[PDB]
Design a binder for this molecule. Sequence first.
Ligand SMILES: *[C@@H]1O[C@H](CO)[C@@H](O[C@@H]2O[C@H](CO)[C@@H](O)[C@H](O)[C@H]2NC(C)=O)[C@H](O)[C@H]1NC(C)=O
Ligand SMILES: [Cl-]
Ligand SMILES: [Cl-]
Length: 221
Amino acid sequence: DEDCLSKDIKITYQELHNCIGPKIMGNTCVSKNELYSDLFSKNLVTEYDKKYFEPDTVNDQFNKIEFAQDAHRMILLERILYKTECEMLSLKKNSGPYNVAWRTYLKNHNIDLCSRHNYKMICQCINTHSMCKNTDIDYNKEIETYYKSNAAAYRADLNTIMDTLKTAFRGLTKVLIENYIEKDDSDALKALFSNITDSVQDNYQMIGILKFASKLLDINL
Ligand SMILES: *[C@@H]1O[C@H](CO)[C@@H](O[C@@H]2O[C@H](CO)[C@@H](O)[C@H](O)[C@H]2NC(C)=O)[C@H](O)[C@H]1NC(C)=O
Ligand SMILES: [Cl-]
Ligand SMILES: [Cl-]
């Protein structure tokens, strides 16, 4: 698994799936100077990169990634953010202010499916933080029946879920999501959601949200 900083200038959006925060992040948040010495000693950054390791707020790092016009720059800034910003580590778990952020944003303006069908697993996952393991399983295809009869609620709920995911995974993940959403690339979106799933297996509710998101993409209208 070659390092995202090792590879070439021409990078596909598909290869960038290896470089997203959830995947490169571990269980630690080192200082930026320690990450710089670490990557430098691996011949992955140079002194010309040192400016990218200076302190900055997390929102400004988000914007520097999400407006980046160079792929190597986007990869490096994502790596720095998710290796050095301690709050991001909460994404591998259930609790933390960063999880309550997207969690309350999602429950707040809920999805229309849950108004008339509060008993569906996705609705229990969103509202009561429970039953998140089975959110993609549609027993007797009741969820799919609902959406193809209420396309307004389908587009509203799909947009709400996409916005939830883009809020939870600022940076490269959000760039990729917006890219595929504009290209109408549902296969790529399901592949990205699958890749994220592999990296956040201990984020119960977020696993539920990703499963449900992939299910919604199967519902093709
Ligand atoms: C992320 O997930 C995607 C899809 O699950 C992976 O891409 C697939 O890899 C298999 C490996 O045999 C291929 O047969 C498929 O053609 C690939 N694409 C799809 C759409 O299934 C990918 O390997 C995962 N990891 C990344 C991108 O780092
Ligand atoms: Cl469960
Ligand atoms: Cl879990």
